[PDB]
Amino acid sequence: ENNDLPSSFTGYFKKFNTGRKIISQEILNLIELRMRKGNIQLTNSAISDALKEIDSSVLNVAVTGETGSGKSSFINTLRGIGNEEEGAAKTGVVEVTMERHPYKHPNIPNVVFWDLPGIGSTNFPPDTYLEKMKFYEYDFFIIISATRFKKNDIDIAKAISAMKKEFYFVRTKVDSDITNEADGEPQTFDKEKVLQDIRLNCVNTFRENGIAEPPIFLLSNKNVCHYDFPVLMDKLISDLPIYKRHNFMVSLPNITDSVIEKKRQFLKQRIWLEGFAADLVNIIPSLTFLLDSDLETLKKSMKFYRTVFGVDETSLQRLARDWEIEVDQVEAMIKSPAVFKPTDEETIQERLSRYIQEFCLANGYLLPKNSFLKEIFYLKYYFLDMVTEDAKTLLKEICLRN
Ligand SMILES: Nc1nc2c(ncn2[C@@H]2O[C@H](COP(=O)(O)OP(=O)(O)NP(=O)(O)O)[C@@H](O)[C@H]2O)c(=O)[nH]1
Ligand SMILES: [Mg+2]
């Protein structure tokens, strides 16, 4: 195929949708220009900066609404926390306080959810409210409502729109409405129709009050991944500057296979980046000896991936708790927990040695003839596929246990 490095390096990213790239074209060109000239110190530095930006990226998400709107369950769902685990948002807690309480993401501390007090329980008018709540500090400004449209909510929307700014409308408890129509309306019932009506009623409420009509999302916290949740996350990511997508993408709850699959694609681009900033070699990866200086990097990488896909230690026992079984049985459903557990069958070195042969037999080296990433990186790809698979497996169990 292509025996050119600069060319092969950037040729890799065309394997992802324009919106699922984690680095801009411009930045990608910078890296190539340097690489083209052969200036190794500068191309490593360029990549390094690019990853520095991605990581240091901070994300502030503001969520507002009246009590019982679903505001807590929402924020907790976006953090992978139960509605009662230590560090969860509680109802009316912020309302009484009358002050915004932040909630850093457990694994991605750079992602912050700001639970804002319902304007109803504050002696602040719309504009003063936003002012006190520091509106221009959030990347996202969500307004959450349930079945009844609150007059307060309307005024806030009216203030933001009149301000020429944007916000998202997350309507919850849609499940309640579908169960009510099904009950009283035997045949004249249809979730698809009920859904449509609820949506057009939100649309008009905004139009009627002279609001520009924002992105609307109907959903249920008593059964996420079922309605506009997947769409909600796609929209949120799409509205982000490229460099901020990575951190928010990997933070997202693993509610569907697509979310999970989208996470893997992002990380497959990070490995490639790390692989090159680390500099290529001419020795076949399966013929290398793994140093402890490497086994660590790989143990650290595995802990991160596992956490990102919710198949780590905590997440596991948490699931054992629900299903009333034990972690063991759970770890027996997936593969990643075993990787670093010494068994009578083989030692770490022996196992990782095999993973590299299998990976390259199935995927070949990803570069031009006699060019290779350092072994340590092919293993990350391997770990990444294993974790992705595991998350998917467990997600099936979660649903298979209704
Ligand atoms: N059926 C159903 N219930 C929901 C949904 N979202 C939240 N709830 C329910 O509402 C209760 C509490 O909602 P919760 O999110 O705590 O309220 P809150 O909006 O956060 N209060 P606060 O606004 O003060 O933060 C729980 O009983 C949960 O069943 C939903 O989409 N469908
Ligand atoms: Mg709350």
Side-chain angles (χ1 to χ4, degrees):
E1 310 171 308
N2 174 38
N3 300 291
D4 187 61
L5 186 67
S7 176
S8 287
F9 171 77
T10 57
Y12 186 71
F13 295 84
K14 287 180 286 182
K15 296 176 175 179
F16 311 86
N17 299 305
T18 61
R20 285 161 178 168
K21 277 151 161 54
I22 80 167
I23 177 185
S24 68
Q25 195 55 60
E26 306 84 298
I27 290 182
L28 189 50
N29 291 338
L30 200 224
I31 300 168
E32 218 207 324
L33 266 304
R34 227 51 70 207
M35 197 172 292
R36 231 165 66 65
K37 301 319 235 151
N39 187 162
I40 297 191
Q41 188 199 182
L42 291 196
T43 93
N44 295 317
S45 183
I47 300 175
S48 163
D49 292 335
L51 289 183
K52 196 281 191 173
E53 177 171 54
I54 287 166
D55 291 321
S56 61
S57 187
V58 158
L59 206 64
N60 303 289
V61 180
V63 184
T64 189
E66 299 328 308
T67 304
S69 56
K71 206 201 308 178
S72 289
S73 306
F74 182 74
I75 284 178
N76 299 320
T77 291
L78 273 308
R79 305 173 63 197
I81 304 310
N83 280 35
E84 36 42 50
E85 285 178 42
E86 184 171 63
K90 212 180 190 67
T91 295
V93 63
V94 303
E95 311 291 22
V96 186
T97 295
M98 288 182 65
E99 289 169 58
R100 68 177 196 169
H101 185 295
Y103 293 79
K104 300 163 296 183
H105 188 278
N107 314 141
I108 314 295
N110 285 48
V111 169
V112 192
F113 302 91
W114 295 84
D115 193 322
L116 305 198
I119 191 171
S121 60
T122 63
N123 308 82
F124 292 140
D127 290 296
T128 299
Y129 180 77
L130 299 168
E131 198 170 57
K132 261 72 282 184
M133 299 302 99
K134 298 162 189 172
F135 173 88
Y136 299 68
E137 268 180 43
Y138 318 101
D139 298 284
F140 301 130
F141 190 75
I142 321 291
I143 284 183
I144 308 185
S145 179
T147 53
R148 319 285 198 307
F149 235 112
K150 277 65 202 311
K151 188 51 189 172
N152 302 66
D153 291 347
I154 295 295
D155 292 314
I156 289 177
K158 206 179 304 179
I160 309 179
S161 180
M163 210 172 89
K164 295 287 189 173
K165 287 298 177 293
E166 176 164 296
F167 67 94
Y168 302 71
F169 191 69
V170 184
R171 207 286 211 182
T172 42
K173 313 196 172 184
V174 168
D175 52 298
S176 291
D177 303 289
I178 306 171
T179 61
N180 280 52
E181 178 79 314
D183 190 297
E185 280 51 46
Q187 209 309 76
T188 51
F189 162 66
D190 188 295
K191 55 297 299 180
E192 299 109 297
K193 286 187 174 188
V194 172
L195 251 27
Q196 190 164 303
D197 291 354
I198 301 181
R199 180 167 299 160
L200 256 46
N201 293 191
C202 293
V203 174
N204 293 156
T205 284
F206 290 122
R207 322 265 303 196
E208 286 198 51
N209 299 71
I211 315 302
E213 186 183 311
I216 295 168
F217 309 83
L218 304 187
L219 47 72
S220 57
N221 278 305
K222 283 291 164 294
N223 192 175
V224 308
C225 73
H226 237 180
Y227 300 119
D228 303 312
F229 230 111
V231 214
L232 171 53
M233 301 191 283
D234 289 353
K235 174 57 180 176
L236 290 171
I237 287 298
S238 69
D239 297 334
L240 241 38
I242 303 178
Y243 65 84
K244 318 191 73 165
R245 299 176 171 175
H246 176 283
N247 280 172
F248 189 48
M249 186 68 245
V250 303
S251 68
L252 297 174
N254 302 285
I255 68 170
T256 65
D257 285 340
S258 296
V259 178
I260 297 180
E261 193 53 51
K262 197 170 178 181
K263 274 177 166 183
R264 173 212 249 147
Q265 292 310 300
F266 264 71
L267 294 173
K268 294 179 67 165
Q269 288 179 64
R270 184 181 225 286
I271 298 172
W272 187 243
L273 290 168
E274 302 176 305
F276 274 77
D279 305 312
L280 312 196
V281 295
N282 68 310
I283 300 180
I284 314 179
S286 57
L287 295 171
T288 290
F289 192 63
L290 228 34
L291 300 179
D292 290 287
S293 173
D294 297 314
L295 281 63
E296 282 312 306
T297 308
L298 284 168
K299 293 161 187 168
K300 300 164 185 175
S301 294
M302 184 63 104
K303 293 174 184 175
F304 174 67
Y305 292 167
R306 288 185 66 182
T307 281
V308 169
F309 292 82
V311 288
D312 50 297
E313 310 62 57
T314 307
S315 299
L316 296 190
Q317 53 213 187
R318 202 180 319 192
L319 297 170
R321 179 175 63 188
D322 316 320
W323 314 341
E324 308 181 7
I325 62 177
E326 67 182 7
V327 180
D328 282 55
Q329 297 167 292
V330 183
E331 298 190 304
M333 309 181 106
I334 63 172
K335 318 191 185 316
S336 54
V339 172
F340 296 98
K341 289 184 176 177
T343 74
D344 285 342
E345 188 178 304
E346 65 191 305
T347 180
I348 175 59
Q349 287 288 323
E350 298 167 1
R351 179 180 289 97
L352 296 187
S353 177
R354 182 164 54 74
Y355 290 166
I356 311 165
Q357 290 198 69
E358 311 192 319
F359 182 85
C360 297
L361 264 184
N363 307 272
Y365 316 96
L366 312 168
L367 306 147
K369 297 178 183 179
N370 293 299
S371 290
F372 314 84
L373 293 172
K374 288 174 186 175
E375 179 182 53
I376 203 282
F377 299 116
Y378 292 97
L379 286 182
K380 285 186 182 186
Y381 278 125
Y382 193 83
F383 288 175
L384 183 50
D385 288 335
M386 185 186 267
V387 171
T388 293
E389 296 165 0
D390 294 342
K392 280 188 179 174
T393 301
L394 289 191
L395 179 64
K396 199 65 179 179
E397 275 291 307
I398 291 186
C399 294
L400 210 49
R401 293 165 177 284
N402 295 306

